[PDB]
Amino acid sequence: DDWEIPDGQITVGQRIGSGSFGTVYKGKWHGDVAVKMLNVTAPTPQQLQAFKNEVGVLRKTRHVNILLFMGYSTKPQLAIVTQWCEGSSLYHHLHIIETKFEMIKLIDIARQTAQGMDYLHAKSIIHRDLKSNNIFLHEDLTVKIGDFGLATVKSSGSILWMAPEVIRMQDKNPYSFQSDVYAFGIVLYELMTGQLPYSNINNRDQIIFMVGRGYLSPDLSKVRSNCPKAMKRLMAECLKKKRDERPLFPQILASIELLARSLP
Amino acid sequence: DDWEIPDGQITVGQRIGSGSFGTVYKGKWHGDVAVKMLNVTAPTPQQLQAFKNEVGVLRKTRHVNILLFMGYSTKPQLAIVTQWCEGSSLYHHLHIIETKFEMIKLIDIARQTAQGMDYLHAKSIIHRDLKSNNIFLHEDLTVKIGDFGLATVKSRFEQLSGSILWMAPEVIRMQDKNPYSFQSDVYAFGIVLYELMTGQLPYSNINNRDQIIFMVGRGYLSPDLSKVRSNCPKAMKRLMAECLKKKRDERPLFPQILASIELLARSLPK
Ligand SMILES: Oc1c([C@@H](Nc2ccccn2)c2ccco2)cc(Cl)c2cccnc12
Numbered sequence: 001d002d003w004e005i006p007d008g009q010i011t012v013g014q015r016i017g018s019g020s021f022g023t024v025y026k027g028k029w030h031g032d033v034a035v036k037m038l039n040v041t042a043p044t045p046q047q048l049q050a051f052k053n054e055v056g057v058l059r060k061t062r063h064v065n066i067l068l069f070m071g072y073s074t075k076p077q078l079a080i081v082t083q084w085c086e087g088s089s090l091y092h093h094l095h096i097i098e099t100k101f102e103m104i105k106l107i108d109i110a111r112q113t114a115q116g117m118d119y120l121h122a123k124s125i126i127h128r129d130l131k132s133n134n135i136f137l138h139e140d141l142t143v144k145i146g147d148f149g150l151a152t153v154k155s156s157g158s159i160l161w162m163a164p165e166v167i168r169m170q171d172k173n174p175y176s177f178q179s180d181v182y183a184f185g186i187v188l189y190e191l192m193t194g195q196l197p198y199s200n201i202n203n204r205d206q207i208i209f210m211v212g213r214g215y216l217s218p219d220l221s222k223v224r225s226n227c228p229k230a231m232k233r234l235m236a237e238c239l240k241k242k243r244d245e246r247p248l249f250p251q252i253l254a255s256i257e258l259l260a261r262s263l264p
Numbered sequence: 265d266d267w268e269i270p271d272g273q274i275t276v277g278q279r280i281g282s283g284s285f286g287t288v289y290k291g292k293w294h295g296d297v298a299v300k301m302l303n304v305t306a307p308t309p310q311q312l313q314a315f316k317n318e319v320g321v322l323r324k325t326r327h328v329n330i331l332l333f334m335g336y337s338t339k340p341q342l343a344i345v346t347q348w349c350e351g352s353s354l355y356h357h358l359h360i361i362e363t364k365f366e367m368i369k370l371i372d373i374a375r376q377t378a379q380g381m382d383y384l385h386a387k388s389i390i391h392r393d394l395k396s397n398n399i400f401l402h403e404d405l406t407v408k409i410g411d412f413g414l415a416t417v418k419s420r421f422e423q424l425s426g427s428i429l430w431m432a433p434e435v436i437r438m439q440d441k442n443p444y445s446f447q448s449d450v451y452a453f454g455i456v457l458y459e460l461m462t463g464q465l466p467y468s469n470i471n472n473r474d475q476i477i478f479m480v481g482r483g484y485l486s487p488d489l490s491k492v493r494s495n496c497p498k499a500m501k502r503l504m505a506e507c508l509k510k511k512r513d514e515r516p517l518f519p520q521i522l523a524s525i526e527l528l529a530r531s532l533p534k
């Protein structure tokens with residue numbers, strides 16, 4: 001019952017990026033895989049902690065909509081190995097290559113994402129950084145939620161997806177299922193409008209300040225016409241400035257399924 | 265945090281099928297899933313064992329070409345929950361609806377299956393029932409090796425008698441100690457490569473189950489390789505023949521089979 005990969009079996013290749021801790025690479029281990037390593041040979045103290053935290057969460061997940069954790073290593077360097085997703089992140093599709101998804105496909109992507117979130121929450125896992133860039137469209141179909149570590153289970157910037165309470169830090173622990181729900185709301189906004197929120201404001205600090213005070217919020221009137229009213233309503237629900245008024249995924253999921261069933 | 269699903273969360277629907285090791289369904293648990301249950305009112309001691317053994321093997325797997333194990337339940341009834349595959353099995357594509365896959369695709373299905381087998385064997389897991397019926401073509405793109413009811417971790421039964429087309433001669437004779445090995449899995453893989461390249465099941469012109477069993481076992485009968493498609497790469501027809509060797513110890517292991525398929529793939533027509 002061990003997920004530790006034997007020493008020196010992982011072949012590392014092209015450098016991809018650098019999420020959470022360390023650097024991510026496309027590598028080899030019983031096929032293509034993603035490898036999140038640590039450049040230093042001296043794992044330091046709190047680096048060996050963020051490492052054990054991620055593995056600890058990742059290893060509690062087995063769901064088609066959650067990036068597949070395959071194993072970890074301490075080999076020469078600490079390394080988390082996950083499946084290799086073929087394609088691009090939803091963020092890249094929507095805002096870089098501006099892919100034109102049909103409404104059916106957009107509804108389905110929101111569904112799978114919620115499917116995935118519902119699962120994480122059932123396991124008492126709070127993502128804490130859900131955003132269109134951590135949502136991968138594997139093989140152009142099938143959502144894979146990724147990048148954890150920053151994720152916890154039970155007791156740069158990504159402000160666009162941060163709920164008002166999170167921005168305020170009036171608890172130092174404003175994170176909860178509800179704040180995950182809010183970010184999903186911002187993700188819904190992207191799919192449904194094809195754009196990032198507040199694109200007409202060029203000052204981040206202003207954006208941060210105003211969302212936190214409840215003065216600014218996503219402009220829902222921007223939703224595409226062919227967007228089902230029930231979706232636009234689900235969206236507003238998730239984006240409630242007041243935490244406790246937001247619905248939970250079991251509910252989100254039911255709503256998205258009923259609007260999807262009656263769409264064609 | 266075990267993989268034991270909390271009680272009363274799994275719902276079951278369509279009865280996709282039956283079997284000696286339980287019947288399959290298309291239930292739900294955080295999205296669609298495949299639920300394998302046990303109809304009986306009280307599991308016999310051997311069933312409880314088959315259940316445990318499968319879960320023990322399944323929970324050791326995390327690979328894109330292995331059907332995803334999600335959890336099990338015992339309280340309501342013994343149940344194994346796996347991801348629900350969208351599409352059909354390679355068997356159905358190949359022999360029931362005759363799907364016209366391109367050689368590039370066939371080589372690909374052959375590669376992924378090998379990739380999966382390579383993964384199981386590295387963890388000392390012997391499938392023991394690899395066949396096109398248990399190879400799901402998820403979304404018509406991803407190969408998912410399933411049905412782990414007879415699987416076992418080396419150094420850890422008397423079942424099966426239905427799918428003889430994929431049984432190696434030494435498995436039919438049951439002479440040797442440990443009839444099953446990484447090699448018998450490789451033989452089954454060989455019959456699958458055979459199915460992929462010919463589009464047909466072996467021994468289609470013989471209709472007597474017993475005679476086929478006896479003959480393949482005695483070595484009088486073997487897969488007719490002259491039937492392999494003409495556009496089938498030579499190295500492949502060779503790799504196939506090697507996996508089908510009558511002498512167990514002459515068959516290559518998946519790491520080498522994997523290396524070969526990947527090699528003959530890089531030099532394929534354009
Ligand atoms: O492609 C991958 C990325 C990249 N995400 C996206 C998202 C949209 C389009 C293109 N890439 C990325 C890397 C670094 C920073 O972002 C990140 C990780 Cl962890 C992967 C893990 C396994 C397979 N593929 C992965």
Ligand SMILES: Oc1c([C@@H](Nc2ccccn2)c2ccco2)cc(Cl)c2cccnc12
Binds near residue numbers: 283288350353397411
């Ligand atoms: O569909 C599934 C089957 C059935 N196989 C096929 C093959 C071709 C077309 C349709 N179904 C089946 C039924 C009975 C005994 O095996 C078996 C498993 Cl393990 C599955 C696991 C996840 C998703 N789907 C699965």
